Design a protein around this ligand. Sequence first.
Ligand SMILES: O=C(O)[C@@](O)(COP(=O)(O)O)[C@H](O)[C@H](O)COP(=O)(O)O
Ligand SMILES: O=C(O)[C@@](O)(COP(=O)(O)O)[C@H](O)[C@H](O)COP(=O)(O)O
Ligand SMILES: [Mg+2]
Ligand SMILES: [Mg+2]
Lengths: 92, 454, 455
Amino acid sequence: NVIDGRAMIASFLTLTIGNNQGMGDVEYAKMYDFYVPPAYLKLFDGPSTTIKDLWRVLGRPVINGGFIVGTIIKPKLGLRPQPFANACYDFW
Amino acid sequence: MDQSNRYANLNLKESELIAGGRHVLCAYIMKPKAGFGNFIQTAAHFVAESSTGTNVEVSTTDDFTRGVDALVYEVDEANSLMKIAYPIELFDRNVIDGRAMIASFLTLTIGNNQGMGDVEYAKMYDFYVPPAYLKLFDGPSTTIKDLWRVLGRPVINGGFIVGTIIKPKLGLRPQPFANACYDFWLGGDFIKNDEPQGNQVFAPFKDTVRAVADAMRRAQDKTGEAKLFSFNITADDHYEMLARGEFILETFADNADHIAFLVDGYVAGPAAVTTARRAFPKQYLHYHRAGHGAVTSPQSKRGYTAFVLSKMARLQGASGIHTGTMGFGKAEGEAADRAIAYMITEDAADGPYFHQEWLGMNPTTPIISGGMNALRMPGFFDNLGHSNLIMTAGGGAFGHVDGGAAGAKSLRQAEQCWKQGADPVEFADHREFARAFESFPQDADKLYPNWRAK
Amino acid sequence: MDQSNRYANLNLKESELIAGGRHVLCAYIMKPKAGFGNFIQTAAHFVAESSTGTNVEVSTTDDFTRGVDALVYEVDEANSLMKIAYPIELFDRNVIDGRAMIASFLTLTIGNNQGMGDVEYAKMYDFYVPPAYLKLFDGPSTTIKDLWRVLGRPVINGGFIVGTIIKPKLGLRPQPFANACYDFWLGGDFIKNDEPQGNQVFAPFKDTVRAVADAMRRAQDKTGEAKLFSFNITADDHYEMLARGEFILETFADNADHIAFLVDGYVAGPAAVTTARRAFPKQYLHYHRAGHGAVTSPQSKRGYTAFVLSKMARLQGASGIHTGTMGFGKAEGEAADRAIAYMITEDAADGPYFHQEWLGMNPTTPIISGGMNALRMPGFFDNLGHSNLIMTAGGGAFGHVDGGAAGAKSLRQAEQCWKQGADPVEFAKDHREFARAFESFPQDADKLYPNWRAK
Ligand SMILES: O=C(O)[C@@](O)(COP(=O)(O)O)[C@H](O)[C@H](O)COP(=O)(O)O
Ligand SMILES: O=C(O)[C@@](O)(COP(=O)(O)O)[C@H](O)[C@H](O)COP(=O)(O)O
Ligand SMILES: [Mg+2]
Ligand SMILES: [Mg+2]
């Protein structure tokens, strides 16, 4: 980045797994692993928020706060706002 | 008017108030002014002027209001001690993101009550914040770890960061400034703007920033080690802070993560701190507390102590704050101030009155500064117990007889001396350290009576 | 280290330093701590720690640095007096617009020197700013003139603005709060949030603002007179302040120029004040000073006085600032504080040590508050000499036996009483609301008017 000198995953992708995926003389190629050294590693954002903050909100230990019971609202689509909220209320 | 029946309930148990998690607790040293009400009456008026009331009865008051009254729950007149519990519902919240603000905490706990005519003085020594309120504060986003990471040090116990402040405080033009930076960086890690340095007519911000960036590159090329700089971005105007920070990070480019931002947090206020904390969360936030001594001094019996200031600074999100030299330097301070550092570094710690759990909130680095030099550090480290911190010595570094680089190396060797548990005079097989005796002979005379003989 | 030869020059003349216009002057009351240097030595170190130096010599110093040194030019050890001249080149300037910042003034003039080990205490009592530096400060953009204009009063000597603070300080939910506003506005002009009122969970910001706006509409419809409200928009976060101000002005719409923004300037700091000043220059900026007493109190020998704070607030761009009751209310204060108001209202005025020309910088309103009521007002006006100001009485209004409206009217009648030059007790015979204030605060009545009961 010009603005803050930090890294972008887009360049990593463009180079390591970009045009080489269209090569005519290659049948196939797939990346299974990659290593980033400290000088490059330290330039990525990394997570700023973690599960600890959810544990904290839940009143759990912020280290090994344990299992967070979750769901996804189903139907995937079709519930109008209040039925949606009713399903939310019920699960909660 | 006696409001004790409403605002005082001494039968409440601090342990229960703590267990409940619905109250902020504050401990004050307060003294009524002669010729008014007694201690509990005065404490009651104090609570009234600090929460829901005034100096007379008003008809608009209802029971819901009485429900959120702050209350005096503990007093000890012999020791002028007074503890007050504030329901957390009192404290203001951001409309935009529902988070807490220290400004409300200040307005309520140590605001108007500092102007009361019937009170001679009242000063805060400690406070407790329960989880529901604690979790609403920003806390630090960047820590000393990121500096260690940049320096190539271990991110756990990465050790001592040798720092300095550019002296003169003001007066250096851009290139001489950058030259002193280059010189110190040959032997040291860290350099900060002196707190007032910025965009003086004789040292324009952008020219200086460019020259220092060049100096950083030259120093890193010369030494093969990473170097850090803390730039002052303090301003009245939010957008000026933004302009300065943006220019700095863009200008430093691939060294942008070598940059810290200094904010004069006490005089410019929490708003500036928050501007920096929220605008540049990925840059070490260096809280400079210039002016604090007007209230934190033991000579003062009003306002709040340095301990309170530091704990607030940890809540506001400072990556580091000056905690003072703890009696070992030129500023007012005590050895017991070691307790302040522990309060800002640990996940759990004891204040003078309240125990505090931090729930994994990031630590704030204790920055040690104020008349320090190579000779004075061994005593300081002995009192604190560790060297996982940043130390800046302006005069202590540039006042070295052999220049800034030797000063830096003298600081480095001084810390190596402390970690080896060696005797300073005997340790002083180390020229730069030894020359600090000659640099500051009065100090040398005081700390090591017969250093000359040896 | 003795630094007197470098940082002290007692041969300098104050009149020439003033005439030169290249120096900020500051007057301090300072005392060295026993067991260190003498007065001039300590003053020299004080200057060193407040400009270009430190506690020891450094090889990095050049002649240019020595050229911009601050200097002690006057001392009086018998009276603990110390005066320092700061070259204006020292003070930080904005990159974006080249304007001054009070934060730099503070960092230098009253910053680190408050932590010095060889000083027992030091307190700033006055300061002088020359034209070249003065003109770089924002100054107020809106004044009491604009409230007078909104109220339909003359924009010159528009007279007394009757105000209150919503009490309880905290605890009222949106509609009861708005009900109290409506009640007061039937007899008064101006209402401010109490300083901590904002977005408490039991009183959400937007609901309260909407309810108050409705109360304003109803009150203006009821009285056929314009009403004013001062909303607290203080926050740590700049963008929260913006969000609050923007919501208020949009919500009040055609009554938007009836709105002032209150900022807790001392605890939140100059940045918040400046946020409001620069983001909303067309809205009256109401500077609230909660916490100042920690340093401004005469019990304190550190920091700065209320006079200094007020003069700074005028520089920062406050439309009005609280100056205290000058001994007539519940807070610590003296009659001589009348001098502060003059400093913030006039184009030229005298401080305890320095005369200040303001060169047409807008005035800042003295906002009077702290345990005031109708009975105590005549003496305050007698001491001050005018009523061109805003006065807010929370307990004095809502503590009135007949409620907020009668209290408001009692304050109104109290100022009319002072302006008519009438005897209060004789005046009370023909003005019920004023008279009921005697019964509302009988101890105040007993002290101020010994035999009011017989009459
Ligand atoms: O004098 C100064 O302004 C310093 O640069 C120290 O320089 P020196 O090392 O040359 O003395 C620091 O800002 C103070 O230590 C801050 O005070 P504190 O830490 O107490 O808040
Ligand atoms: O909370 C209060 O006490 C007030 O609302 C006054 O209420 P009352 O009218 O009922 O007394 C004001 O904020 C103080 O006067 C501020 O003090 P100052 O102006 O001196 O800075
Ligand atoms: Mg400094
Ligand atoms: Mg108030």
